[PDB]
Amino acid sequence: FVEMVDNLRGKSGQGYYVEMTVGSPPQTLNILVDTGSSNFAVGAAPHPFLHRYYQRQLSSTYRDLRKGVYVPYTQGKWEGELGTDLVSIPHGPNVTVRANIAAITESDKFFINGSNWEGILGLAYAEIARPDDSLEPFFDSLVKQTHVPNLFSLQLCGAVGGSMIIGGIDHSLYTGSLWYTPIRREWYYEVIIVRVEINGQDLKMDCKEYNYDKSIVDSGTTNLRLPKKVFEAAVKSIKAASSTEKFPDGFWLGEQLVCWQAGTTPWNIFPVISLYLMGEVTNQSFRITILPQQYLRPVEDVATSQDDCYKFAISQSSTGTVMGAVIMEGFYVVFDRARKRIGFAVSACHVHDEFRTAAVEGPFVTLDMEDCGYN
Ligand SMILES: CC(C)c1cccc(CNC[C@@H](O)[C@@H]2COC/C=C/C[C@@H](c3ccccc3)NC(=O)c3cc(cc(N(C)S(C)(=O)=O)c3)C(=O)N2)c1
């Protein structure tokens, strides 16, 4: 797995990407790793923000599937033409497999000026593939075509880099225990949140609320996104904990940055946030704790660089909870498809400071026998 270590790069909340090749002869593209969707898609026509794109006419292994496809995410949108071709991951397992590829020919607010990636690897299940669930996702083809075990793990670092280990778990990438929460249903990587605390204080809502109307693990979304009711309760609590300083409403909404004299950020006025995930046994849970160094994301800009400036990276959602890269960075996350479970452990690349450390820990029990799944 050592060959696979540090095979991810990124630009800081611009997304983590892995090098892949498509076509014969191999065309090199950087591909965003997305556990929040299930299409493999690449830029296939010129675009002002693409340094390079897939040229189907140059690949003798390309087969056209005579079917278009359109994919709108929460933000960003592309459309294109389906086909298959040979795909490999130079710093992944040593194999080449044939896979579906959407060749993107038009898009909106999807590619980013200077991002370095030219396509997207949807690693979730066929149930949410477009145009429908008969379009086998990349990781399904990989496992069917090779002897790779049905598991991958992500260590997203930033603050960027990281590792996606295909087929296994690399112990050098984490410390302490791995804790597992069940995948509720194979579509998104859907999980169940049973309790939320902000500086050790329970939000005290019915736990179904935390999962209204699903909770997902999504490396393709930057923020921790929360159902409105949870988001409003979370912000109330963070504000109360951090009340020695008062920030504008635009800060709370992600529309404005807050800035401090370089090196003087008052991390200790901001609370730790704990998400307790359903465990593998009845009414047991574990918690993952995040520090303000994860949920206050630095915005790099030479122009404001006398300061450190941050965006609040918790935001509201009308489509359920999204545990985005805010939650994943500094955890080693194991997508154990074979055992229908997702493991979390503290990563070798945790942020911590001299006072507080992100954690994955348990077990915790609750007598209340309510199931937290929203039907
Ligand atoms: C089943 C499919 C069709 C579907 C449909 C609807 C929702 C989903 C759930 N998964 C979404 C994921 O798949 C795509 C993937 O997008 C990858 C792009 C990353 C670029 C990055 C970025 C943009 C601009 C500057 C820096 C980074 N975007 C976000 O962080 C980025 C990306 C996305 C959402 C956000 N949020 C809205 S946010 C502002 O963090 O709250 C942020 C997003 O939609 N990501 C899935």
| Ligand 1 center–CA 154 separation, angstroms | 17
Spatial separation of the C-alpha atoms in residues 95 and 111, rounded to whole Å: 28
Asked if residue 76 has its Cβ within 6 Å of ligand 1, the reply is: yes
Asked if residue 225 has its Cβ within 6 Å of ligand 1, the reply is: yes
Delineate the domains of the chain, giving CATH numbers in brackets. Answer: 16-148 (2.40.70.10), 149-375 (2.40.70.10)
Q: Is 34 a catalytic residue?
A: yes
SS (HEC) of the chain: CHHHCCCEECCCCCCCEEEEEECCCCEEEEEEEECCCCCEEEECCCCCCCCCCCCHHHCCCCEEEEEEEEEECCCCEEEEEEEEEEEECCCCCCCEEEEEEEEEEEEECCCCCCCCCCEEEECCCHHHCCCCCCCCCHHHHHHHHCCCCCCEEEEECCCCEEEEEECCCCHHHEEEEEEEEECCCECCEEECEEEEEECCEECCCCHHHHHCCCEEECCCCCCEEEEHHHHHHHHHHHHHHCCCCCCCHHHHCCCCCEEEECCCCCHHHCCCEEEEEECCCCCEEEEEEECHHHHEEECCCHHHCCEEEEEECEEEECCCEEECHHHHCCEEEEEEHHHCEEEEEEECCCCCCCCCCCEEEEEEECCCCCCCCCC
Spatial separation of the C-alpha atoms in residues 214 and 318, rounded to whole Å: 10
- Please pick, among 34, 85, 140, 308, the residue that the annotation labels catalytic: 34
- Supply the Cα-derived Rg of the chain in whole angstroms: 21
Looking at ligand 1, which atom is closest to the CA of residue 188?
A: 1
Which of 160, 221, 228, 311, when mutated, tests ligand 1's pocket best, judged by the most ligand atoms within 8 Å of its CB? 221
Spatial separation of the C-alpha atoms in residues 61 and 52, rounded to whole Å: 19
| Ligand 1 center–CA 77 separation, angstroms | 10
Spatial separation of the C-alpha atoms in residues 53 and 117, rounded to whole Å: 10
Token pair for residue 362?
Answer: 């348990």
Asked if residue 268 has its Cβ within 6 Å of ligand 1, the reply is: no
* Atom 16, ligand 1: residue with shortest CA distance: 220
| Ligand 1 center–CA 123 separation, angstroms | 14
Looking at ligand 1, which atom is closest to the CA of residue 75?
A: 44
Resolution in A: 1.8
Asked if residue 222 has its Cβ within 6 Å of ligand 1, the reply is: yes
**27-34 and 119-122 beta bridge pairing:** parallel
Q: Is 25 exposed, middle or buried (0-12, 13-18, 19+ CB in 10 A)?
A: exposed
Spatial separation of the C-alpha atoms in residues 227 and 203, rounded to whole Å: 13
Is there a contact between 372 and 201 (Cβ–Cβ < 8 Å)?
no
Measured torsion, CA atoms of residues 348, 351, 354, 359, in degrees rounded to the nearest 10: -70
Experimental method: X-ray
